[PDB]
Amino acid sequence: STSVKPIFSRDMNEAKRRVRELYRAWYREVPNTVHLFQLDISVKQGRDKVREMFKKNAHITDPRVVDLLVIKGKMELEETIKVWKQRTHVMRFFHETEAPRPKDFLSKFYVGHDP
Amino acid sequence: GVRTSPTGEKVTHTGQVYDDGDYRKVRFVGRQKEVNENFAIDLIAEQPVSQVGSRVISCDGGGGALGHPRVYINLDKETKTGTCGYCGLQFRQQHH
Amino acid sequence: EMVRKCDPHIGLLHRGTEKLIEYKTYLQALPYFDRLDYVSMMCNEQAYSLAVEKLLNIRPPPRAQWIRVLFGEITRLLNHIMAVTTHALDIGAMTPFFWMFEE
Amino acid sequence: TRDTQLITVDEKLDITTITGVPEEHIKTRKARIFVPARNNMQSGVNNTKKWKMEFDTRERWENPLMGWASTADPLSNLVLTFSTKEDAVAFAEKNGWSYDVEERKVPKPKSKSYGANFSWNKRTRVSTK
Amino acid sequence: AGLLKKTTGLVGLAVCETPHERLKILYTKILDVLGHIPKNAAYRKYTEQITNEKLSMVKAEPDVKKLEERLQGGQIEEVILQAENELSLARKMIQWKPWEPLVEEPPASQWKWPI
Amino acid sequence: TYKYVNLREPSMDMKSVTDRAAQTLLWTELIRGLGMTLSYLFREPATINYPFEKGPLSPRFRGEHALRRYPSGEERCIACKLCEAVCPAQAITIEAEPRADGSRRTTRYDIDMTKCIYCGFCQEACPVDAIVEGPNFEFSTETHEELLYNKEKLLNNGDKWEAEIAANIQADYLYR
Amino acid sequence: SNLIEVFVDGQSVMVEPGTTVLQACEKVGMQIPRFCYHERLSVAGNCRMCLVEIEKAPKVVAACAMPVMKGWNILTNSEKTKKAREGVMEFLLANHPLDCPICDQGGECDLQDQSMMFGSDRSRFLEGKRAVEDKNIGPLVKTIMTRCIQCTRCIRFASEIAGVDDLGTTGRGNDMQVGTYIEKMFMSELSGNIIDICPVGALTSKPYAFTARPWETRKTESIDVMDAVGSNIVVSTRTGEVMRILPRMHEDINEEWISDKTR
Amino acid sequence: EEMLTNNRIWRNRTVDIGIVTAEDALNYGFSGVMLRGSGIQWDLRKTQPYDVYDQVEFDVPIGSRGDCYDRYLCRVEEMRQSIRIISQCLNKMPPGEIKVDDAKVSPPKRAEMKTSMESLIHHFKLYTEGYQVPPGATYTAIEAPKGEFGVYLVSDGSSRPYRCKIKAPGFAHLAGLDKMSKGHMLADVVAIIGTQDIVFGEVDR
Amino acid sequence: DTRPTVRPRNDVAHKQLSAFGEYVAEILPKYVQQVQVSCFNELEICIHPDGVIPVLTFLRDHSNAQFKSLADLTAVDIPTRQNRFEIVYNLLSLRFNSRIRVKTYTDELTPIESSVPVYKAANWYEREIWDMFGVFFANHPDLRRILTDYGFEGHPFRKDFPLSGYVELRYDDEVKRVVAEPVELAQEFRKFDLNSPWEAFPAYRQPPE
Amino acid sequence: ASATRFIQWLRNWASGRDLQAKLQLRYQEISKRTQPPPKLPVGPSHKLSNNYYCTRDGRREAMPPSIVMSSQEKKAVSPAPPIKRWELSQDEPYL
Numbered sequence A: 001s002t003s004v005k006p007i008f009s010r011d012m013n014e015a016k017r018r019v020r021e022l023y024r025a026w027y028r029e030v031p032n033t034v035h036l037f038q039l040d041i042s043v044k045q046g047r048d049k050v051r052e053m054f055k056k057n058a059h060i061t062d063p064r065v066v067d068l069l070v071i072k073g074k075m076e077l078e079e080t081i082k083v084w085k086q087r088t089h090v091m092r093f094f095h096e097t098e099a100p101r102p103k104d105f106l107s108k109f110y111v112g113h114d115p
Numbered sequence B: 001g002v003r004t005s006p007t008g009e010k011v012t013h014t015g016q017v018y019d020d021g022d023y024r025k026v027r028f029v030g031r032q033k034e035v036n037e038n039f040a041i042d043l044i045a046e047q048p049v050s051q052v053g054s055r056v057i058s059c060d061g062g063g064g065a066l067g068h069p070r071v072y073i074n075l076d077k078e079t080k081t082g083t084c085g086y087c088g089l090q091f092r093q094q095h096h
Numbered sequence C: 001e002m003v004r005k006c007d008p009h010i011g012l013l014h015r016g017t018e019k020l021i022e023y024k025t026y027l028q029a030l031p032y033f034d035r036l037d038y039v040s041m042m043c044n045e046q047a048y049s050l051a052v053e054k055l056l057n058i059r060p061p062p063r064a065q066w067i068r069v070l071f072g073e074i075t076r077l078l079n080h081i082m083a084v085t086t087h088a089l090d091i092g093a094m095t096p097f098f099w100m101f102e103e
Numbered sequence D: 001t002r003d004t005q006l007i008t009v010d011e012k013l014d015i016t017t018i019t020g021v022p023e024e025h026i027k028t029r030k031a032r033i034f035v036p037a038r039n040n041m042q043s044g045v046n047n048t049k050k051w052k053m054e055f056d057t058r059e060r061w062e063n064p065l066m067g068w069a070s071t072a073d074p075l076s077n078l079v080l081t082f083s084t085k086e087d088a089v090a091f092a093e094k095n096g097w098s099y100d101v102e103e104r105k106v107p108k109p110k111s112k113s114y115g116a117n118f119s120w121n122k123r124t125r126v127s128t129k
Numbered sequence E: 001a002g003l004l005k006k007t008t009g010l011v012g013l014a015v016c017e018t019p020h021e022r023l024k025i026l027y028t029k030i031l032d033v034l035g036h037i038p039k040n041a042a043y044r045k046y047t048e049q050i051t052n053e054k055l056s057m058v059k060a061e062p063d064v065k066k067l068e069e070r071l072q073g074g075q076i077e078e079v080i081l082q083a084e085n086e087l088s089l090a091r092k093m094i095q096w097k098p099w100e101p102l103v104e105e106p107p108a109s110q111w112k113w114p115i
Numbered sequence F: 001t002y003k004y005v006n007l008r009e010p011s012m013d014m015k016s017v018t019d020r021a022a023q024t025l026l027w028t029e030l031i032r033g034l035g036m037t038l039s040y041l042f043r044e045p046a047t048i049n050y051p052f053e054k055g056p057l058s059p060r061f062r063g064e065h066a067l068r069r070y071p072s073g074e075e076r077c078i079a080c081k082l083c084e085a086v087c088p089a090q091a092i093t094i095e096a097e098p099r100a101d102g103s104r105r106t107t108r109y110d111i112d113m114t115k116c117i118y119c120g121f122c123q124e125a126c127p128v129d130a131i132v133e134g135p136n137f138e139f140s141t142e143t144h145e146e147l148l149y150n151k152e153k154l155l156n157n158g159d160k161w162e163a164e165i166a167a168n169i170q171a172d173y174l175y176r
Numbered sequence G: 001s002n003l004i005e006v007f008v009d010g011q012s013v014m015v016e017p018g019t020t021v022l023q024a025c026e027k028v029g030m031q032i033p034r035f036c037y038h039e040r041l042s043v044a045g046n047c048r049m050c051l052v053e054i055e056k057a058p059k060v061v062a063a064c065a066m067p068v069m070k071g072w073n074i075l076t077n078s079e080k081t082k083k084a085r086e087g088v089m090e091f092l093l094a095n096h097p098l099d100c101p102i103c104d105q106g107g108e109c110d111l112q113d114q115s116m117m118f119g120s121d122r123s124r125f126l127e128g129k130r131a132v133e134d135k136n137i138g139p140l141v142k143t144i145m146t147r148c149i150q151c152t153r154c155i156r157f158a159s160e161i162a163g164v165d166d167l168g169t170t171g172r173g174n175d176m177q178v179g180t181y182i183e184k185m186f187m188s189e190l191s192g193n194i195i196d197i198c199p200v201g202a203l204t205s206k207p208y209a210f211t212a213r214p215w216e217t218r219k220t221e222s223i224d225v226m227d228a229v230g231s232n233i234v235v236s237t238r239t240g241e242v243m244r245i246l247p248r249m250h251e252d253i254n255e256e257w258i259s260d261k262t263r
Numbered sequence H: 001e002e003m004l005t006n007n008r009i010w011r012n013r014t015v016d017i018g019i020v021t022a023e024d025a026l027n028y029g030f031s032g033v034m035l036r037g038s039g040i041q042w043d044l045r046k047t048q049p050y051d052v053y054d055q056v057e058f059d060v061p062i063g064s065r066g067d068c069y070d071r072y073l074c075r076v077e078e079m080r081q082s083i084r085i086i087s088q089c090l091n092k093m094p095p096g097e098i099k100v101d102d103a104k105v106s107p108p109k110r111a112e113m114k115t116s117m118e119s120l121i122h123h124f125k126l127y128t129e130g131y132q133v134p135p136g137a138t139y140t141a142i143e144a145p146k147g148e149f150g151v152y153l154v155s156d157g158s159s160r161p162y163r164c165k166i167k168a169p170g171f172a173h174l175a176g177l178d179k180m181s182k183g184h185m186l187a188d189v190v191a192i193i194g195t196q197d198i199v200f201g202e203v204d205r
Numbered sequence I: 001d002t003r004p005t006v007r008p009r010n011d012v013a014h015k016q017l018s019a020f021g022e023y024v025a026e027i028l029p030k031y032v033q034q035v036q037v038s039c040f041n042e043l044e045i046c047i048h049p050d051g052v053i054p055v056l057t058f059l060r061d062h063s064n065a066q067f068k069s070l071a072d073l074t075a076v077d078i079p080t081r082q083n084r085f086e087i088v089y090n091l092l093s094l095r096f097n098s099r100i101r102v103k104t105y106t107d108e109l110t111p112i113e114s115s116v117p118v119y120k121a122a123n124w125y126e127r128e129i130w131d132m133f134g135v136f137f138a139n140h141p142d143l144r145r146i147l148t149d150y151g152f153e154g155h156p157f158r159k160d161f162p163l164s165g166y167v168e169l170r171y172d173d174e175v176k177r178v179v180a181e182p183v184e185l186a187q188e189f190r191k192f193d194l195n196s197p198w199e200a201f202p203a204y205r206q207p208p209e
Numbered sequence J: 001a002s003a004t005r006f007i008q009w010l011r012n013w014a015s016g017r018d019l020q021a022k023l024q025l026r027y028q029e030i031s032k033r034t035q036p037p038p039k040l041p042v043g044p045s046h047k048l049s050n051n052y053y054c055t056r057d058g059r060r061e062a063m064p065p066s067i068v069m070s071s072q073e074k075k076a077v078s079p080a081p082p083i084k085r086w087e088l089s090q091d092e093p094y095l
């Protein structure tokens, strides 16, 4: 039952190799992206954001899911490197317009009914 | 008919009017609130009751296929006038 | 100006038509088909109607079939005028577009 | 048999990260897995044959301009259909939603006798047909 | 045969100056490949049956235009290409081994509709 | 059956070869095309002098929406909400309540004309010929809000366009 | 043990003695058409819409009232069964008013739905129709009795559930009228439930009159707090407003009824 | 045609431009004129006829060189045959009704809906819930002006379709633009886009 | 076939297509799981997802088939099934004037083998499936989004994706660019419950549970 | 239509076709815009007898798909008989 067709990785050790390789490519590419897209952020800010995205999923332990996340990341790399994206797409990771939303009970209580 | 509120705003045939403290009446500043002056409740009441000689009458609203679905109205109660559920026309049975 | 590679990027007119259709009735979904190949409107309707009739296991009446074919072939003329006269315009022949769009 | 060369994964299935759903609409949403009640205004029972999944209701407010009903809940009209409770629970679990299961209420079999309407010594005798 | 065709009518398909010889070579090749396939396999029993039909018609009819009518495969060049395709398929079947039993039965309600 | 669109071979006699050479050197066929454009120059143009001249239309034309009345002046609409249910675009919003005289009438009847596809399903569904797509097509606005129609707007359009609307229905109601 | 064996379209089902053809068809998933039968009311056998053919028998039997007999094969989709349904529906709709647009039962009417599934697509009735007086039985129930199909569900509910014997039939034939004869109010702690059982728009809710349509309402399953019985209910909401309260069936509490206060 | 068919400039821009072989056109999924310009004898109105296309006579134009010029000639000749079909449809138009006389699917006439109870019920239900369609799945295709247009329609038994996949001829034709544009200049690619006949409401959906 | 309103039946095709289904099942037992022919005469072959290339190649190249054209390749989301995604191949045979549907299945994480080697038309169709449903086709020339916006996260055509999505776009003058924000609708989409409580088609009645 | 005789010759000669016979601008040969009222026919099912819907119900004649096979010396066959070669048009074989 648990026997399942793999995507690329046969174990988490082989998958975590692809995660690290992907982080390398992203880390090289932020300096060019800031220059090419003419963004008003720093290279450190972009490299921090890459770290944040890689940290969000820091809990997964399924080799197949990690492969898909790596596949999706690599696609976003082809888009950004080849300038298929635009300045609006690259800057959507930073959520500049979204004013900070309350994250404490009292603040949520004063504004609305949401959990 | 169109009656005006103490603020001056026209009241609609649905009874809608903005109360004194409502900010939404600012949308009418420099423009107008569009209200139809022909209130269908008043115009139907003007139509005379029809005197008929049967316990049951049919109404299609006029025009045949250009009216409303045909219905039959019972006129066996003499304390009221049979009314159509579509066109609002009233009928009464004429004492034989 | 010699083309080494062509990468057609589409989806700039993707409008979630197929998902919207699942929230509509069969009749409600028909106008979506006029707005697909919006140059062959009645032809697209006919394909959808044929599919639904086949599932319903009904048959359209004869006169309707003849009307469909008539307006299907009028629709073909409409499409082939646009295809021919915008192929020519892109190539520089502006005039025929005006002559045939009056038809 | 299948000769693709397979791997063993003993982890539970969790696909939350690869579904594109914002975090707020996973952690804080409560799913309801139920068999819809029959509309008491009609006697048909064909809308009680399949399980459904719904989500918690959230705020709807009046549009200032026209008074329409405005919402910020993307999962407001999302209703899923399942053949079984197990299938529904599996789908919720893999998508990381918290769920509450309510068991099917089946009409109880009953005793129906037209003769009892005309009983000789019982209270089931009807006074009108 | 007769006067050679100027054109098959299909773009990218070239007239064959030796149609009968080429067909005999290919059909015979297919039968040799089918020999390696296990005997009871239905691909061998069916592919032999149709191919030996086609081979008999080539040997019987000298004229090309009469052969095309009997083979019902279009122009003779269309038939020759189909022979090459079957030969390619035959070689692939030997590695796939589709005559073997079903790898796995589907889940319980995989093909049930309506759900 | 099929036909070949471009499978003809040329004639190689000297007269034919010479004629083609003249076509190549003296541009006969190109000159031929110039004649067609010259003929069109002396034809009457197909242009109409809008807005003083209008393009032809039919009674079935689907245009600006209107709410109609019976000859008495009573609203035809009974709040059945069939138009709301069939609208492929969810452009119609209806709320109803019993009128002071007990009639089933609407308190809200809103059409978002920027959601409408002008399909006419709502005038097919209506059982009392209350909602109609009228003849008008000249109701462009300077703002979006002016295209969110409420009940009063739709009734004024009916009272504005009733004479034309009724006549068109008289012409086409036998086909419907 | 004591179970007998019957066949529904050839498929065997074991049913306790005393079971009806109807109840047997349920155990194979088939719902016989119905207008007068209600599982929580007494059997009446008057609408004649449940008629079903028994193989090797020349007369159709009312499934709602006929007990099954061992060996019977019940033909629910036979031509005789289908033609009986079409005839009955034709009689039901002959004098029915053309009121669906103005009738609050539209979209949740069994006459509409069962006409579509088990009836014809057209009428051959070229005559006039019956019209009936309206009867005031209180401020909670609206009576448009021209829509009544004389199923006597209201009469049975009041007698057999509410314990009030104020509803009955006056007259005979086509002129038979359900009502109170006198001017009376059917006021009771369970009065509103006649609205639900009435399969047509003859009995409707006055408070809910004209406000909504069935398809545009979202159904929320909640509980009643007006009392301590904890009656299970459905809250129909449209556009962030509460439109009506309907019962939700719970066998061990409220069955399929609620009190007027809850409603 | 006087302005284009024999014009040396038009022929120069379209002849031997976008040559697609018959074999590749099939595997790449082409249809319609794209196939018929390469010499493939295929028109769904003649092979899988629908409606009353088997009671009308018309000829299918076929190309020989597989180029933009042949596809131009096929489309222009297809216009002539449509006029040929229109003449037959005009003279053989039969009398009778125009929608199936089964009011559980098709709406009744407004006169009946306002006079008959069954008609009104069907009108009410057809315009609110709609007709229920038996469960199933069909791929139905036609010879649209742009090629083969098809729908994969799935029914769950309800009045609302479960899945509807739209097969547009331009979706496959556009994917072949790279193959069709090899060894060509920028202006040639402009022509190859036109010969394919692309509307992006069907390519995107 | 004298009933005016009822679709005529063609038994000759039903017998022909049924036999060809037996033909395929006999030749490809290793992958074929089910063969069915419909009332309106369409043949469907249902296969294990590991026989996509073998089965498609056989149908394309076998001399008693010659399905050279891939008319369409799509997917259907059925959440209740543990393998929620049904992959459908519709093929056309010009030689025999016939159509065949091939069906297989997969789940969110299990890849399917790309059919590009068999039909070069499948390149874009497979990209659309990935973009819209999230199914991964292994050994694809270039698998990437084709219909969705750049950076779009999610697979819209899954039954669990909201119709109006999770984000919406507008132009913000402060940042002088188009920005994405969570979706708020002035008028919420109105969900209409249209299904009737009364069964319509007895022949498809599902056996009681 | 209003063109002088000289202009008709000039444009006819330049084009090469009698353009006045087949003008592209509609004049008085079109149909009147006000037409007599219609009276349309009725369908085959507008009958008062022998018109039971159970005999003309296409939806209910649809059956579930036949299952030819399920995991739960024949001659070879083709999906259908091989297609017939088309014949050249006798109206105009070559354009």
Ligand SMILES: CCCCCCCCCCCCCCCCCC(=O)OC[C@H](COP(=O)([O-])OCC[N+](C)(C)C)OC(=O)CCCCCCCCCCCCCCCCC
Pocket: F024, F025, F026, F027, F030, F031, H008
């Ligand atoms: C008699 C005593 C001895 C003296 C003898 C003197 C020589 C006399 C005989 C020489 C013949 C020369 C013929 C003319 C020149 C040929 C030009 C040529 O090469 O054509 C081939 C070219 C090429 O035609 P092609 O289609 O064959 O191109 C391919 C060429 N091959 C196949 C050979 C590779 O044709 C063109 O020039 C087309 C031009 C397109 C633009 C046309 C625009 C429209 C113009 C219309 C109006 C023209 C009138 C202008 C009048 C101006 C008034 C001021």
Ligand code: SF4
Pocket: F083, F086, F087, F088, F089, F090, F091, F092, F111, F115, F116, F117, F118, F119, F120, F121, F122, F123, F133
């Ligand atoms: S015309 Fe069509 S889209 Fe517009 S309001 Fe009427 S039903 Fe809706």
Ligand code: SF4
Pocket: F076, F077, F078, F079, F080, F081, F082, F083, F084, F094, F122, F125, F126, F127, F128, F129, F130, F131, G101
């Ligand atoms: S269909 Fe006609 S009567 Fe019914 S709500 Fe709409 S406009 Fe009013």
Ligand code: SF4
Pocket: G096, G097, G098, G099, G100, G101, G103, G104, G105, G106, G107, G109, G110, G111, G112, G147, G199, G200, G201, G202, H121
């Ligand atoms: S009770 Fe039913 S059939 Fe009768 S008018 Fe009301 S909705 Fe129509």
Ligand code: SF4
Pocket: G147, G148, G149, G150, G151, G152, G153, G154, G155, G178, G197, G198, G199, G200, G202, G203
């Ligand atoms: S009023 Fe309603 S419940 Fe009472 S008999 Fe008539 S239809 Fe039946």
Ligand code: FES
Pocket: G033, G034, G035, G036, G037, G044, G045, G046, G047, G048, G049, G050, G051, G062, G063, G064, G065
């Ligand atoms: S349900 Fe049996 S007669 Fe009414």
Ligand SMILES: [K+]
Pocket: G105, G194, G195, G196, G197, G198, G199, G200, G201, G202, G203, G204
């Ligand atoms: K009721």
Ligand SMILES: [Zn+2]
Pocket: B059, B060, B061, B068, B084, B085, B086, B087, B088, B089
């Ligand atoms: Zn009236």
